[PDB]
């Protein structure tokens, strides 16, 4: 969807548009530190949801 930073608000909003089913995975938070101030990788973000 985007090739820049998104941070929770967008990180979560995207993980939502990324999967759109069971609210993707968002509890442990093994990320958000490089996808908010740094760029991420839609490929990896598309693997958080089941």
Swiss-Prot record:
**Where would you find this protein in the cell?**
Secreted
Which controlled-vocabulary keywords does the entry list?
Carbohydrate metabolism, Cleavage on pair of basic residues, Diabetes mellitus, Disease variant, Disulfide bond, Glucose metabolism, Hormone, Pharmaceutical, Secreted, Signal
Report whether Endoplasmic reticulum shows up as a keyword of the record. no
The disorder this protein is implicated in is: Hyperproinsulinemia: An autosomal dominant condition characterized by elevated levels of serum proinsulin-like material.
Q: How does this chain assemble?
A: Heterodimer of a B chain and an A chain linked by two disulfide bonds.
Which family is annotated?
Belongs to the insulin family.
- Its name, as the record gives it, is Insulin
Name its species. Answer: Homo sapiens
Indicate the span of the full protein covered: 25 to 110 of 110
């Amino acid at each position: 969807f985007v090739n820049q930073h998104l941070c929770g608000s967008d990180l979560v909003e995207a993980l939502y548009l990324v999967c759109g089913e069971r609210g993707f995975f968002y509890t442990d938070k093994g990320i958000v530190e490089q996808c908010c101030t740094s760029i991420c990788s839609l490929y990896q973000l598309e693997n958080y949801c089941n």
